[PDB]
Paper text:
Lipases function according to the classical Ser-His-Asp catalytic triad mechanism. In the present study we propose that the Ser → Cys conversion in lipases may lead to high activity by accurate manipulation of the local environment surrounding the hybrid Cys-His-Asp triad, enabled by laboratory evolution. We succeed in evolving cysteine-CALB mutants that are even more active than WT CALB.
Notably, variant QW10, which has the natural catalytic triad Ser-His-Asp restored and only differs from the best variant QW4 by the residue at position 105, displays lower activity than QW4 with the hybrid Cys-His-Asp triad (entry 11). In QW10 and WT, three or four H-bonds exist between S150/W155 and Q291, while in QW4 there are only two H-bonds between G149/W155 and Q291. For QW10 and QW4, S105 and C105 remain in close proximity to the substrate carbonyl group, favorable for nucleophilic attack to occur.
Numbering used by the authors: 0 to 316
């Protein structure tokens, strides 16, 4: 079972949410073959995909579109999802009422499944989801000394055992809602645990196409968080998920010969070097970005699914 009924109301005006959506070389209301790219924590849309999937999806025939929820995905994850839901509705109608793919990284995958869980209207508008290193269960790795100064709202909510991650799980959000592919690695230095190749991993979704790099490439295969998005292996897996008639990556489309953790071969030399510096804005955000001293309160639609957890207002019930 999943949440049903009308979409919850947005807490932000539509002009604010519309302001966060951009398409490369096209208007959101008139776009050909759009793809929604959702960035990770501590970054904007261009910062996550300029070096990788904005050019890679454009070469595959898509119009790169993205959201950049302020500030740098560090604010309340529930509010970042409003940008995605509004963008999908806009891009669905903007492309002649046709389904569009969604490709994410880091918190972006958590944002995608959160929207599909609690905003039922977009379930018939997303044809597939290609999530790179998503943290559906949050992460057990604390911030690089983010325990005496607090952390960003989105960092609170991405901690294992948070009210947000609890509510997503309890609402049935750990089962895929659209055809979903999850590409992750046991060597992820930001999102853990990922070492079980099982529902214990943070990126695992039941009935999804869960691709742990070590399961395909070997137990000693190393590929970090940024590589999980930009690698040639990730391109092969992602390109398979986008081309597939089932909506999921196909095991026949990739193999041990594609196990390259370096940036995708099709990227230009400037793009590969830029892809290696993917987390540079993320590093700045965790050390010098906004911080608060409690996990943001749950919105009314998600509050009933995390009874017992403490947020800024107190205990849910």
């Amino acid at each position: 079972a999943l949440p049903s009924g009308s979409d919850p109301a947005f807490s932000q005006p539509k002009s604010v949410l519309d302001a966060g959506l951009t398409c490369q070389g096209a208007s959101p209301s008139s776009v050909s073959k759009p793809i929604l790219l959702v960035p990770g924590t501590g970054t904007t849309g261009p910062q996550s995909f300029d070096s990788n999937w904005i050019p890679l999806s454009a070469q595959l025939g898509y119009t790169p579109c993205w959201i950049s929820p302020p500030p740098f995905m560090l604010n309340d994850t529930q509010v970042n999802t409003e940008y995605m839901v509004n963008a999908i509705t806009t891009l669905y109608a903007g492309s002649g009422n046709n389904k569009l793919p969604v490709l994410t990284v880091s918190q972006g995958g958590l944002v995608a499944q959160w929207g599909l869980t609690f905003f039922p209207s977009i379930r018939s508008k997303v044809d597939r989801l290609m999530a790179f290193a998503p943290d559906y269960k949050g992460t057990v790795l604390a911030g690089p000394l983010d325990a005496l100064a607090g952390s960003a709202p989105s960092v609170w909510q991405q901690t294992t055992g948070s009210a947000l991650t609890t509510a997503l799980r309890n609402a049935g959000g750990l089962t895929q809602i659209v055809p979903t592919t999850n590409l992750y690695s046991a060597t992820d230095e930001i999102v853990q645990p990922q070492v079980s190749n099982s529902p214990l991993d943070s990126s695992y979704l039941f009935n999804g196409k869960n691709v742990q790099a070590q399961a395909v490439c070997g137990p000693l295969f190393v590929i970090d968080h940024a590589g999980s998005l930009t690698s040639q292996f990730s391109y092969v897996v992602g390109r398979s998920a986008l081309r597939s008639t089932t909506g999921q990556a196909r095991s026949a489309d990739y193999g041990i010969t594609d196990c390259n953790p370096l940036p995708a071969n099709d990227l230009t030399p400037e793009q590969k070097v830029a892809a290696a510096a993917l987390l540079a804005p993320y590093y700045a955000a965790i050390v010098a970005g906004p911080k608060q001293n409690c996990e943001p309160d749950l919105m009314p639609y998600a509050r009933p699914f995390a009874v017992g957890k403490r947020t800024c207002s107190g205990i849910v019930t």
